[PDB]
Amino acid sequence: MVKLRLKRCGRKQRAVYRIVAIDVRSRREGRDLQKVGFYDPIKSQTYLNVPAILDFLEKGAQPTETVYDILKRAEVFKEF
Amino acid sequence: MSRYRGPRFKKIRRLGALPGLTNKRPRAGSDLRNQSRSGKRSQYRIRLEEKQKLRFHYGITERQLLKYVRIARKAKGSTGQVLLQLLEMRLDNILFRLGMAPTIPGARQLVNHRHILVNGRIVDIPSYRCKPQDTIMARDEQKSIALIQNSLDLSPREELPKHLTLNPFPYKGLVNQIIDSKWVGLKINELLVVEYYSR
Amino acid sequence: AAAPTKKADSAAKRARQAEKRR
Amino acid sequence: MKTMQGRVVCATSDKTVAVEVVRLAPHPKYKRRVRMKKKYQAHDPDNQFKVGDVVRLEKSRPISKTKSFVALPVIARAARKAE
Amino acid sequence: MPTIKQLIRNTRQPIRNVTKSPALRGCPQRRGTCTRVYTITPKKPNSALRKVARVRLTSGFEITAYIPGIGHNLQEHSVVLVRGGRVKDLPGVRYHIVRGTLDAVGVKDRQQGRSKYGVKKPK
RNA sequence: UGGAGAGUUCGAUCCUGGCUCAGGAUGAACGCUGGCGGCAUGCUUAACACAUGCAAGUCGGACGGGAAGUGGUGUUUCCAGUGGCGGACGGGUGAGUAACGCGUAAGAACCUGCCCUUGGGAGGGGAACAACAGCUGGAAACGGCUGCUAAUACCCCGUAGGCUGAGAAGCAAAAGGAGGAAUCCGCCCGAGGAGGGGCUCGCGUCUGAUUAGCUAGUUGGUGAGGUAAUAGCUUACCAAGGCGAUGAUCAGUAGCUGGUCCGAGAGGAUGAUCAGCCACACUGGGACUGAGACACGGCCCAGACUCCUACGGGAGGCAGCAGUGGGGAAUUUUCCGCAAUGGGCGAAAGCCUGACGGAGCAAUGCCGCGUGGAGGCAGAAGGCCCACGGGUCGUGAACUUCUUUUCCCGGAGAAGAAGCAAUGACGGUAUCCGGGGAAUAAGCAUCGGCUAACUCUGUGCCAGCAGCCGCGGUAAGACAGAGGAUGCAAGCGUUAUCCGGAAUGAUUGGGCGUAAAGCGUCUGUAGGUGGCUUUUUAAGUCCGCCGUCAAAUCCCAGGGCUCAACCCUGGACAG
């Protein structure tokens, strides 16, 4: 199946963390079919594209732990 | 080695021109001769001795200079002038033209021993490129040293370069803009050095 | 060191269950 | 689906016609036209199209491993060598 | 230039390429045991007593090699290491010897080139 | 925003032309030397043979239980066993394969666990079975009988949109379990979505034609058989074709690509690391289970090896991580952790996880810093040259004031943790404050010309040098040592290898009277090219637009680690 999370591109101490749209039967840092948005830990840079989200979640995509919390930190996912 | 150690005024001699590796030393070259007519230097000699004059003045290596001339060649604008842009923006060279240090090899030690502050933050790296509107100043702890006080005691009378503006009392110097062709006062032809790397 | 009781990882267990499904 | 034109060279086969497609295309390294010719085994269950006819071939359901194309229309008649 | 329509028919392409010194599968250096250590005379302009040794490589080939410097200690059972460079004065010799490695000793009392010839630092 | 050459074939000149060198690069080795830090990288030679440990397990909110540990006086939790899901994910190698493997662009005859949208159903029964128990064959492995037993183990019956069929009609599904005054999860069928995986077609995909012939299910057509599915995939029969010089077949070699290196570009050489795809995993062969692997850590058979044996008979295979032997010029700690990201399982907790996150070894490379700074003599010793009247090494050093990064020592101490009894391997972390003292830290190559840099001795075609032209037979700046100088830098030099220089295969870029070069001359098929006018087509071509050209490289502009390397946004480009 397909799910939402974050990969790894930046090695060592600087863990930048990538975008997402990947299968569970694939790799930790491999092939990604579509792009969305990411966040940087030791910075104020928080993207997360909203029109890409909810459009991918309607067709069997599972929202797992890491894509969450950073979702509610922004103005998306609330009682609206 | 990062910066040449040993004989400094051996390169102020031989080459003909007189750079600032120390303060001021005689015009004549080495050995018993050299005060008379020298031999006819080849076409490749004028490209080799002119680049070694620019390499020694700033106290930079061949490995670090190779990057500053290649990135300046890939960038837009006059190549011959943008070699002197990224080389003058170094924290060890802007410190010589500020009046805080008597020479360039002594200015690298000043930046390395944590005496200089850039925009409030402390920088140790001499090969750091100083962008415009930056405040190059001294530290509050290193304000009481006798070497920093003696070098800035001779500065209120002498005129500093037009691309810089120093204020004698608070010991800070600001960099307004980029250095151009007629603003450089060095005895080097920038068209002979760019012709060497492209053999 | 070795354990006081006897044990053996049966690779024939996954084969017997595969023969039962067959 | 893709459509390619060509002349029939062989007709001595049961419900199968050998169509030779000529294609002119310029070389990406050079400049001039390089002509390539490959023969396709088309399907003809009505055995109407004989040798010499120029027919257009469209993509369809594979009736065999070599055959995958069918001959639907006809632009011109016999353009072959005289007997 | 050969015409454009003949360049599609024939198409110009280089050869399989011949090597200057066959040191196997792109290997910089090769090991081997010396079979016979002899002395041979040079070409037409030179006249000296040059020391050459036939090295039996790890592949099974027995090619000649030149010994640099003054004085050596290579016997009939010495395991040497070759370099790969021509001398162009002695016919057949396409290899050189790296001294200071394995059974090959370095040149005594040499103060100049210590990187090559395999000499240590004198205190 | 990109394109410098020179030496050598002559008495000499101008051409032609081969060779050689200056450059960059390489997952490199060797020799000399050797202060650190950041990031990356590391059997490229035997896909050789492998000790040991580890690399996949998890659920009792599916069951009959309870051999451990902790409470209470039976609940957590849980060794085995039944059952569910995952072992066809991830990791590694590239041997094989020039092939419908790969890359680009299209197509039809499809399947598809977990997830998701919609509709209906989920009733009522049966017979066993491990675990366990009593015996029992064997060295061991592995088991052999009898009896007892549960479930989301299995098999009927009832019902049924779907399926088969022109139609009428015929016919097939089930699991229950948990917290709570009825919620959650799961089960069965069908119709979709998504994602993944098959199959079809065309182009481009190495070299040699002193391999030109190749091919019987071989090509195709009817009929049955078969697959999830088209189909010679298959069988019988009929036709006899099918492939090829725009070069099949055969032989040698080889994973493909995004890209990488060089280059002005074109092009050439490759494709290590990262990522997509394919293939293999002791060798050869085969099938089973399952949605999917005919499947590294699964099974069965055979073979070569290794090991055990009460020789009757059995157990394994690292092209997973770390390591051993061996080969080799050469390539590392049998370390720590789940903390972070991810994978498996579970309504969770949590467990498993050398994937991975980190550390360790190695100057393998890239980048940054450091090993001292200023001041100092009339140029001190001591060396080298000397016409000995001096000069040079030399401000070099000593001598003086000064600052002390990094290394060392002591005290603090950001963030990567979001979760959320406050949860980290890395960490005596980054970084910051202070204290000794320059105190602990440089060499290597070269010096005839291209090549940037000189003489004096010794030797003396002797010993030796050497990329090329060439040096050495007594005064050779091209041998050996010294003084000095040049270049570079903890790197330097050498070697190997690709590209550049080679407009010396030239498509952009060359030539054939004499330098290499028109075949001895004609006819002529295929092929290439083809006068003039109008109309038409518009295929080529050209314009615009819509898809795709994965991401990451490269490039432009802009950010974050004190700079840089490195990391990163958007755009550009992907011709």
Side-chain angles (χ1 to χ4, degrees):
Chain A
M1 204 57 241
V2 70
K3 75 289 160 74
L4 296 312
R5 50 193 68 247
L6 36 270
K7 305 182 181 192
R8 284 178 300 227
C9 55
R11 304 178 70 146
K12 281 288 183 295
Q13 191 64 247
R14 305 187 306 252
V16 194
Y17 290 115
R18 279 295 193 120
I19 67 286
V20 70
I22 185 178
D23 308 306
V24 220
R25 41 139 273 164
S26 298
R27 226 250 161 154
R28 327 288 139 251
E29 48 265 309
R31 200 178 185 162
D32 208 59
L33 44 292
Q34 276 297 113
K35 293 191 177 297
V36 54
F38 65 105
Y39 85 108
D40 203 68
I42 336 168
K43 210 175 272 65
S44 300
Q45 193 193 291
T46 44
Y47 284 141
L48 196 103
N49 202 56
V50 60
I53 294 298
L54 202 275
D55 189 70
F56 208 80
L57 282 293
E58 58 175 63
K59 37 112 160 183
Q62 290 290 294
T64 51
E65 214 69 65
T66 56
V67 73
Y68 263 146
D69 209 88
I70 190 67
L71 206 80
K72 72 182 75 177
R73 201 177 182 100
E75 36 273 292
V76 60
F77 191 65
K78 203 182 72 181
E79 293 185 90
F80 195 69
Chain B
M1 293 215 271
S2 298
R3 173 185 54 111
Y4 195 80
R5 328 194 82 83
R8 57 212 74 147
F9 47 100
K10 186 78 77 177
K11 290 292 172 66
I12 292 183
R13 307 175 78 164
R14 283 173 155 258
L15 282 57
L18 293 79
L21 284 166
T22 173
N23 279 8
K24 194 182 178 297
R25 283 290 79 122
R27 197 196 70 180
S30 297
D31 293 2
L32 193 269
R33 274 78 185 186
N34 290 62
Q35 296 193 337
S36 189
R37 189 191 64 97
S38 56
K40 199 253 169 184
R41 48 194 295 181
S42 299
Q43 202 173 75
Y44 204 63
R45 275 281 301 274
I46 317 166
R47 274 79 131 278
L48 190 274
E49 211 179 271
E50 203 70 74
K51 79 113 206 294
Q52 206 71 242
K53 194 181 290 180
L54 191 67
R55 188 183 168 269
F56 245 89
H57 184 278
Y58 297 79
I60 196 166
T61 62
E62 189 65 60
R63 202 95 293 155
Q64 296 178 263
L65 188 67
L66 252 166
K67 296 202 297 173
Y68 285 129
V69 298
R70 280 182 299 195
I71 273 71
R73 195 186 292 252
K74 295 172 190 297
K76 297 184 75 63
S78 56
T79 304
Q81 186 49 229
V82 300
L83 307 178
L84 300 168
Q85 180 187 111
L86 287 300
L87 209 57
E88 217 87 73
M89 276 204 270
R90 297 189 72 209
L91 204 52
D92 56 281
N93 187 79
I94 209 267
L95 217 264
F96 164 63
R97 299 179 180 271
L98 216 70
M100 281 187 67
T103 185
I104 313 92
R108 189 175 295 259
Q109 292 290 111
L110 257 278
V111 179
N112 197 68
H113 294 328
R114 300 198 314 130
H115 300 338
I116 290 89
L117 298 172
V118 183
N119 295 298
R121 294 181 180 95
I122 195 147
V123 183
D124 282 67
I125 309 300
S127 59
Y128 166 69
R129 47 184 66 173
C130 301
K131 53 157 71 182
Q133 289 175 70
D134 282 31
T135 58
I136 313 299
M137 55 171 93
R139 197 176 174 85
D140 52 279
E141 293 180 64
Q142 319 302 127
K143 189 185 174 181
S144 301
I145 304 176
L147 218 160
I148 284 76
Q149 196 184 265
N150 196 57
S151 57
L152 284 158
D153 204 274
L154 301 168
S155 193
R157 213 263 171 268
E158 282 91 88
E159 289 290 295
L160 296 97
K162 310 297 174 184
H163 68 111
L164 302 188
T165 171
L166 181 81
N167 209 307
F169 189 67
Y171 305 121
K172 59 183 180 65
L174 333 174
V175 53
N176 51 81
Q177 247 183 105
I178 295 299
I179 186 165
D180 209 64
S181 192
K182 293 294 175 182
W183 275 253
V184 185
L186 276 67
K187 291 286 182 296
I188 195 259
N189 193 261
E190 57 277 289
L191 301 99
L192 288 165
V193 303
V194 69
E195 215 262 310
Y196 181 74
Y197 295 107
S198 51
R199 224 252 178 257
Chain C
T5 181
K6 37 81 67 184
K7 57 256 290 176
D9 291 291
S10 54
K13 186 203 180 70
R14 294 265 65 141
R16 279 186 298 139
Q17 286 181 95
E19 286 289 287
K20 280 290 178 295
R21 293 171 200 154
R22 191 195 106 269
Chain D
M1 299 185 266
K2 297 291 279 73
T3 315
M4 281 178 262
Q5 57 112 272
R7 198 196 71 99
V8 183
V9 68
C10 193
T12 174
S13 187
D14 293 278
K15 296 177 184 178
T16 306
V17 281
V19 186
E20 290 186 305
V21 177
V22 193
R23 208 180 72 100
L24 307 170
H27 210 288
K29 190 184 176 181
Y30 306 117
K31 234 92 67 58
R32 70 168 303 244
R33 54 160 212 82
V34 190
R35 60 152 62 201
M36 55 79 61
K37 203 169 88 294
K38 193 190 187 177
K39 59 185 303 303
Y40 296 74
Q41 293 282 285
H43 196 38
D44 195 26
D46 300 280
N47 67 88
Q48 194 186 293
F49 309 128
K50 56 273 289 179
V51 56
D53 299 301
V54 54
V55 289
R56 297 192 297 175
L57 269 56
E58 296 184 305
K59 288 186 174 180
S60 286
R61 189 182 180 179
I63 43 282
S64 80
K65 62 162 190 176
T66 318
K67 305 171 70 179
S68 294
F69 286 74
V70 290
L72 191 277
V74 57
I75 51 168
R77 302 196 74 212
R80 52 181 175 193
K81 64 278 269 68
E83 287 184 60
Chain E
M1 60 174 263
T3 183
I4 53 280
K5 29 245 165 59
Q6 198 182 250
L7 242 294
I8 301 171
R9 289 175 62 231
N10 197 267
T11 315
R12 321 298 138 125
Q13 192 72 58
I15 50 168
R16 198 113 290 154
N17 294 298
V18 60
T19 175
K20 201 176 183 180
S21 54
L24 284 181
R25 51 192 70 178
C27 300
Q29 293 166 318
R30 200 88 285 182
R31 193 185 61 95
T33 315
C34 271
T35 48
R36 286 198 67 86
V37 186
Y38 67 117
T39 319
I40 195 72
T41 178
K43 225 178 180 295
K44 189 181 175 294
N46 288 233
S47 184
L49 288 172
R50 309 289 176 84
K51 277 75 74 179
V52 174
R54 297 183 182 207
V55 190
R56 179 83 73 153
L57 295 312
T58 53
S59 51
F61 290 87
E62 43 166 41
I63 315 163
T64 51
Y66 187 66
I67 291 85
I70 176 178
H72 64 327
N73 201 46
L74 294 183
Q75 52 178 34
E76 205 179 280
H77 293 294
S78 57
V79 188
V80 214
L81 193 279
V82 300
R83 201 185 70 177
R86 58 149 66 240
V87 65
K88 207 176 183 178
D89 196 49
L90 293 79
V93 189
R94 292 177 278 106
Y95 294 85
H96 264 91
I97 292 298
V98 187
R99 303 175 63 93
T101 317
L102 294 163
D103 287 63
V105 292
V107 189
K108 295 289 181 65
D109 66 86
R110 191 177 179 91
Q111 306 289 292
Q112 203 178 92
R114 294 186 297 267
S115 63
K116 292 181 286 181
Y117 297 88
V119 194
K120 292 286 190 298
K121 180 76 103 296
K123 190 72 77 179

